[PDB]
Amino acid sequence: KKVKIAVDRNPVETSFEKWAKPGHFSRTLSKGPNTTTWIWNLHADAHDFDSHTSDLEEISRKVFSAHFGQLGVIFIWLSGMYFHGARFSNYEAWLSDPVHIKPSAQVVWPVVGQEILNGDVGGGFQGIQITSGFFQLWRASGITSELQLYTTAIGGLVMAAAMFFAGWFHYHKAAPKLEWFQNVESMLNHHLAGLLGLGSLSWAGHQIHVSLPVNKLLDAGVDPKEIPLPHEFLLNRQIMQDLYPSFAKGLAPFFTLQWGEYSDFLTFNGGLNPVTGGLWLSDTAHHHLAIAVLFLVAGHMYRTNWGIGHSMKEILEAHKGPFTGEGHVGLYEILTTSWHAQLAINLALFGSLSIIVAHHMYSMPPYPYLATDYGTQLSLFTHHNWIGGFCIVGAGAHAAIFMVRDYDPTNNYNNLLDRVIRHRDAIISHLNWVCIFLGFHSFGLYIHNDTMSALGRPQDMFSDTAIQLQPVFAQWIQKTHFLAPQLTAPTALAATSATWGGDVVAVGGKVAMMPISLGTSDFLVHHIHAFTIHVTVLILLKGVLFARSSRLIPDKANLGFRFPCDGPGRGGTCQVSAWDHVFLGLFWMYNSLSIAIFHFSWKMQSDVWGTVTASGVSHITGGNFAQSANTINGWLRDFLWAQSSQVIQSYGSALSAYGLMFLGAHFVWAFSLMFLFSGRGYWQELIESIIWAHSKLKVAPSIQPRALSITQGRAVGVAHYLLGGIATTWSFFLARIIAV
Amino acid sequence: WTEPTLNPDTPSPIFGGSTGGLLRKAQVEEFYVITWESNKEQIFEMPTGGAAIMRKGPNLLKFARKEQCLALTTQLRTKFKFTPCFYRVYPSGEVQYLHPKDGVYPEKVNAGRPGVNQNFRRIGENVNPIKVKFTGNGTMDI
Amino acid sequence: GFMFLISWRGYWQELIETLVWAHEKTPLANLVYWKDKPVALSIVQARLVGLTHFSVGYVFTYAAFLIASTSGK
Amino acid sequence: PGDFLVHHAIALGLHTTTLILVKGALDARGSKLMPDKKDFGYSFPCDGPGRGGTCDISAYDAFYLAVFWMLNT
Amino acid sequence: MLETPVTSTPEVASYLSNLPAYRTGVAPLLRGVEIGRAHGFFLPGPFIKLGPLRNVEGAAEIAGCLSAAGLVIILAAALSIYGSAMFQGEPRDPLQSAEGWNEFTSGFTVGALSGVAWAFACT
Amino acid sequence: SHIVKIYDTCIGCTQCVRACPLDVLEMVPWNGCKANQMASAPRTEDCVGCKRCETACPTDFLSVRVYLGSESTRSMGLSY
Amino acid sequence: RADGFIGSTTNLIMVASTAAFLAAGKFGLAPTVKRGTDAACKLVDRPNAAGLISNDPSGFTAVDTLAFGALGHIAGVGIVLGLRATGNL
Amino acid sequence: MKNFTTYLSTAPVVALAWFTVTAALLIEINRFFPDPLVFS
Ligand code: CLA
Ligand code: CLA
Ligand code: CLA
Ligand code: CLA
Ligand SMILES: CC1=C(/C=C/C(C)=C/C=C/C(C)=C/C=C/C=C(C)/C=C/C=C(C)/C=C/C2=C(C)CCCC2(C)C)C(C)(C)CCC1
Ligand SMILES: CC1=C(C/C=C(\C)CCC[C@H](C)CCC[C@H](C)CCCC(C)C)C(=O)c2ccccc2C1=O
Ligand code: SF4
Secondary structure: OOOOOOEEEOOOOOOOOOOOOOOOOOOOHHHOOOEOHHHHHOOOOOOOHHHHOOOHHHHHHHHHHHHHHHHHHHHHHHHHHHHHOOOOOOHHHHHHOOOOOOOEOOOOOOOOOHHHHOEEOOOOOEEOEOOOOHHHHHHHHOOOOOHHHHHHHHHHHHHHHHHHHHHHHHHHHEEEOHHHHOOHHHHHHHHHHHHHHHHHHHHHHHHHHHHHHHHHHHHOOOOHHHOOOHHHHHHOHHHHHHHOHHHOOOOHHHHOOOHHHHOOOOOOOOOOOOOOOOOOHHHHHHHHHHHHHHHHHHOOOEOOOOOOOEOHHHHHHHOOOOOOOOEOOOHHHHHHHOHHHHHHHHHHHHHHHHHHHHHHHHHOOOOOOOOOOHHHHHHHHHHHHHHHHHHHHHHHHHHHHHHHHOOOOOOOOOEOOHHHHOOHHHHHHHHHHHHHHHHHHHHHHHHHHHHHHHOOOOOOOOOOOOOOOOOHHHHHHHHHHHOOOOOOOOOOOOOOOHHHOOOOEEOOOOEEEOOOOOOHHHHHHHHHHHHHHHHHHHHHHHHHHOOOOOOOOOOHHHHOOOOOEOOOOOOOOEOOOOHHHHHHHHHHHHHHHHHHHHHHHHHHHHHOOEEEOOOOEEEOOOOOHHHHOOOOOHHHHHHHHHHOHHHHOOOOOOOHHHHHHHHHHHHHHHHHHHOOOOOHHHHHHHHHHHHHHHHHOOOOOOOEOOOOOHHHHHHHHHHHHHHHHHHHHHHHHHHHHHHO | OOOOOOOOOOOOOEOOOOOOOOOHHHHHOOEEEEEEEEOOOEEEEOOOOOEEEEOOEEEEEEEOOHHHHHHHHHHHHHHOOOOOEEEEEOOOOOEOOOOOOOOOOOOOOOOOOOOOOEOOOOHHHOOOHHHHOOOOOOOOOO | OHHHHHOOOOHHHHHHHHHHHHHHHOOOOOOOOOOOOOOOOOHHHHHHHHHHHHHHHHHHHHHHHHHHHHHOO | OHHHHHHHHHHHHHHHHHHHHHHHHHOOOOOOOOOOOHHHOOOOOOOOOOOOOOOOOOOHHHHHHHHHHHHHO | OOOOOOOOOHHHHHHHHHOOOOOEOEOOOHHHHHHHHHHHHOOHHHHHHHOOOOOOOOOOOHHHHHHHHHHHHHHHHHHHHHHHOOOOOOOOOHHHOHHHHHHHHHHHHHHHHHHHHHHHOOO | OOEEEEOOOOOOOOOOHHHOOOOOOEEEOOOOOOOOOEEEOOOOOOOOOOOOOHHHOOOOOOOEEEEOOOOOOOOOOOOO | OOOOOOOOHHHHHHHHHHHHHHOOOOOOOOOOOOOOOOOOOOOOOOOOOOOOOOOOOOOOOHHHHHHHHHHHHHHHHHHHHHHHHOOOO | OHHHHHHOOOHHHHHHHHHHHHHHHHHHHHHHOOOOOOOO
16 A cells, blocks of 8 residues: 555566567467468557556556657657757748748758749748747747757757657666556646646746746847847846836745735736737736646645545545445546556547647637737647547547456446446437437538528528527627626636627737627537537447447457457348447548538638728628528538639649649548448459469469458548548648638 | 256346346247356346346346347356356247257267258359259259 | 448447337337338448449539539530 | 540549459359359358458449449549 | 336326326227327417418418418328238227227327317417 | 358368357267267257358368348347 | 744734644644544544654644645635735735 | 667568668759650
């Protein structure tokens, strides 16, 4: 019960002998290759540590070390960004004129006429307009030169080497024992206070000493190459005192509890900076300060080696009621003896967080000169939404993996886990019904508007001009948060975001953030999102509940997670596994997220993004979302077809790379329909004829060529299908928004 | 061995109930009844969904599919090394001893089993479909 | 047509099983019942059903273009 | 020269669609994976997950697949 | 299948037993006029307020109850063919019998159209 | 019901029997193999057409053959 | 604590809060290393895994002098700023 | 080193090398002899 560091000295030896023996990890693939399938198998089974061995000590050590490498490659990527933004970038030129200069940090070699990709991003630079929001991130970090980027890049590379070293050291040298990994109370206590709490406080230090004075001077008009370097603010109190008089007192107000005096670098203004169009840096500093105290205190809840504290096992068991049988008693062990259970829960919240971050960041642009960079905003919102949607699908997959691999019917008697597996046909049935309802009562009022418009009856349509369906509930929450600062949140000088309502923030004659108005089309598109979200959940949840068994095939648990079909009998049993419920829940995720990114792309270009002219603002599309989005044709004529002009006509210009990728993406998406619509039977025999030709000329390969497995073809098709569609939108969005 | 007779008053395992068991078919069409004899009270996994505590000595569980009963049969024969036997209760009460229907579980050879559906030719010695055209008889069966 | 080609018989079959349970349990609706047991489309059947949808589309989508673009001018 | 490329593309469709149908016709009653295909008739879903995968092994599925290439051509 | 607080509350297991379908004992025709009027009176609503001629004067209620009558008649034919395709062998509750359904259908057709008329006489 | 046929190419491995999910196959005595056993299919009325037995037949081609034919409640494995 | 604020209402409030909360653990009026609590907020005692050795007669351990005073510090800050925001301070 | 060289011989590594050389050769050829439409 003692929380202590437990390690095993020099377990795995460091040698390349295993490197030369492909498949040493699997008993089955160690015997070498005899068919061309082994090649695809040694990759589809290299990270499945649970399959390699039954010891949970080794599986954990492998997982812990793996994560290290991941961090390493993340550092390498980050360091490369700073380096490319240090040597091959226009960051310094952009700093002087952020509005009229487009960010660029990728220069192509002058060959095969590919030098056309080096467009005039302005600022004596010819490169590729980036949409990663790094320039505005560095600006809000204070970075005012390419020597602070070069140093950072070097530091990231050094960290990378530490990460890989740590992975090898904590695997081949000091490998932690299982008892170490299963101290969840300790992990949470150190990840909440030490990682999140200190991580925010440490940032609240930079933001208060480097980012705030540098950004204030930059917004004051001071030349970037004339601002005092960051360290001078720390050492020279006079400089910081001039910018923030509260540094004349010192740390005395804090200890004297007179925090108020510091109300010049720690404020609750709210809204957006009128100069740069991004959340005040002062408010961000106060947020990270508060967030820190919260996390740091939260780190003192779970019990460790002393006495004070809580026992998550006891808490879960204590929470049981008159309807949920034994209650949460039995989940603690599941979540301290399974990596698939933990991963599933982690991915779900982590993925959902990514979407939530995208909504908040775009609504309240956190970086200077970010909202007026429309390409960056769009590229970020679309990105995080996908990155998150994928994780959620993974959460469903690993959940099913645990159910078919780590579930023990003995530990879960009357748990809320057995009591849910015991009513799966009520959960699934009701969810199926709501999906059908939401379907007809969301996509139907779109076909109805199409038919009524085509029949020349446009007064019999569902629009703000005819049968209206305004989102009243969403319209009231918008007003409770716009008039909140005057009542609910007095200390706040302004509302959290302009989206709720108010004036239009303009920076450089462009709309940084404009109050968004929700109408019939917003109501219609929002319910469309709900229908998709519900369906996606139905497919993944269905796979998890019946991952072990069902009226059709009452032994799936003994068949596995990645098994194609029980057989051609029972009227056909294809895609009965939980991998095939994840396979299909990916297409719906693409369908669900695609509409969301299209909804953001069109709504914004139509109702927010534009140029503030004398008396009025000119939106990218002249405010046509309301009347043009209630029909499916409007989504094709006024969105797809109309906005596709930039990408289809990008050839010959710096944006020509997107036109090429736009088509290339169509090819990949369509190519995927040869594996999603076909079957090995046809390819296997076809290969037999090819082998014959090879065996005639005596050029037949020693390894037996075999067609892709049933599950493999399903994976290859879905992979190319998602890659193609997302790539098409990536080219469309980027070339549209960068051109306009 | 004598085809065991069903005792429909056999203690049934402990289980709260599931929305995943018998439907109208059980009465309108037919259902099946697996029975076994435990050594201790143990939790097993139901081939329909969930967990149940088997009782000591005689146990009796009813399903609407033979595969479900046989699934539990293998589970008991492997996880608990039991020797379960199941029948088929028709709507009229006609119980038919389905497994093993011989005493010796199918896998094991036992004299007294006739050969049914046994073609004595290589699978590649079957006639052409044209030889059985308009005969309404399969090439394999012919 | 894609659903009948991308998706296969199994997720639908098990889904139909849940639907059968719900109807038999639903009151006032349990009175009305199906004469034929609801089953998912056959493996070969779905292949032709999806292909008919796929073909019909390719024909109507083009017939529309070929006629409305040629006539429009 | 624009017609040259499209004409060769039409040839590709003619040859491929043909290859799909011809392969199915020749392997209609024979194949290393399914040497008894004639005994299983023309339209059969598959021979099971045995031998890796027998999905779409019937000569009905050479038609089913050839239709897509025919529409593409 | 899992006796839940919802599917057992004696109040709701009694509400269901007074509805003219679980009230076995009332002659199937009288268990059809009851259900028919109940399902028939509320039918006109959706057509009167949201139908094609919903914004015309006076002819917005005649057109709703005329349309309702139409559907009522359509519902009747489906009820009839159902009994013909379910009681081929004329399968306790006489409603669940060949003659039982033919008298329930008729009670519904004469009760629903009476309800549709009650709703027009209530406008 | 599906048609299951055991050809003379049987080695009496009993693997197909220990593979049937609905007790359709059994091992009867024979003289053409050194294991003096040949799988029979007594109850093809319970065959679902899973073809698990074929996936368990080790002999060249397949000694056991499941010819999916007529479909019933048992053949379709329907618990409705 | 600076600029000789000693004697100031803030000093008195913080001192009172820290003391009132250390004398709520040394005097068994709240959870402590040993004598923890329950699902009904009743001290049901507790075994500490390090087995802290305290000379204090009641057994108050350093873990408990840095876990009750911290509560007093947070409470004092909340009260000081709260009264400060109001007319109370 | 015998086993490191064995790893550097595996298909993925050898293909990565062969292709890189071939790609670089074509790139360098166009770098010195650009716009090679005809063999003249
Ligand atoms: C640097 C020296 C070194 C050496 C000689 C070895 C040697 C060995 N390691 Mg090891 N390891 C190292 C470093 C090293 N390791 C480091 C730094 C880490 C931390 C990440 C690990 C973590 C690790 C784990 C978790 C495991 C091993 C295992 C093993 C043994 C067999 C597996 C193997 O390595 O085959 C060769 C494997 C590869 C060549 C794969 C390379 C993967 C590396 C880490 C990164 C590749 C990611 C790639 C870039 C992703 C992007 C691809 C994309 C660009 C297309 C073997 C004796 C396994 C074992 O113990 O035996 C069962 C085992 O499970 N190692
Ligand atoms: C204040 C204490 C503390 C802190 C700050 C952290 C921080 C972290 N832990 Mg951790 N952990 C702790 C205590 C702590 N832990 C204890 C006491 C235990 C045992 C109960 C664990 C067991 C544990 C496990 C099993 C895992 C982590 C992981 C992680 C990382 C999360 C992955 C990530 O987001 O990468 C983000 C990267 C960064 C934010 C950069 C910071 C990286 C630094 C170098 C990590 C240093 C942490 C370490 C405690 C410092 C001492 C190192 C020293 C001995 C050289 C993260 C950086 C995961 C991981 O290893 O990911 C790779 C994971 O698998 N921890
Ligand atoms: C922290 C996140 C996380 C972690 C740790 C894992 C870990 C694991 N997953 Mg997993 N997964 C995740 C997220 C995660 N997953 C998410 C978000 C999804 C939803 C998409 C999935 C979906 C998923 C599936 C479907 C499966 C796993 C499986 C597995 C296990 C083995 C994977 C393997 O075989 O390695 C091998 C890795 C590969 C073979 C790489 C695949 C090839 C890549 C993805 C294609 C290239 C993509 C890229 C865009 C191409 C660029 C262009 C190209 C030309 C270069 C393993 C323990 C497998 C499993 O355990 O099932 C039994 C399994 O089948 N996962
Ligand atoms: C345009 C192609 C298309 C369409 C229309 C649908 C439609 C549907 N899918 Mg689907 N799907 C597709 C492609 C498509 N899918 C593809 C390619 C895949 C592979 C990834 C999937 C995979 C998939 C899965 C896994 C699931 C669905 C499900 C559903 C249903 C959701 C329930 C619902 O909302 O009912 C509402 C009905 C509609 C939205 C269709 C609108 C049609 C109008 C409103 C009907 C009006 C007719 C009118 C009365 C005229 C009658 C004339 C008369 C002659 C007939 C729904 C009907 C789910 C399901 O089965 O139900 C829960 C589900 O499980 N799909
Ligand atoms: C009588 C007796 C004794 C005494 C003892 C003592 C002296 C005690 C005290 C103790 C103490 C001395 C306590 C206190 C504590 C406190 C602390 C430790 C602090 C903490 C802090 C925290 C927790 C945090 C806070 C915060 C900040 C920093 C920021 C903002 C927010 C807040 C406010 C939250 C002797 C032995 C001598 C003798 C014999 C008997
Ligand atoms: C096309 C297709 C194939 C054929 C796919 C194949 C043969 C994969 C092709 C991989 C490559 C092209 C073959 C050899 C891979 C080698 C690693 C490449 C080495 C060649 C050198 C240039 C390196 C299937 O096997 C299949 C199976 C099930 C459902 C659908 C399908 C399907 O649609
Ligand atoms: S078509 Fe493929 S997945 Fe479907 S039953 Fe046949 S072998 Fe299995």
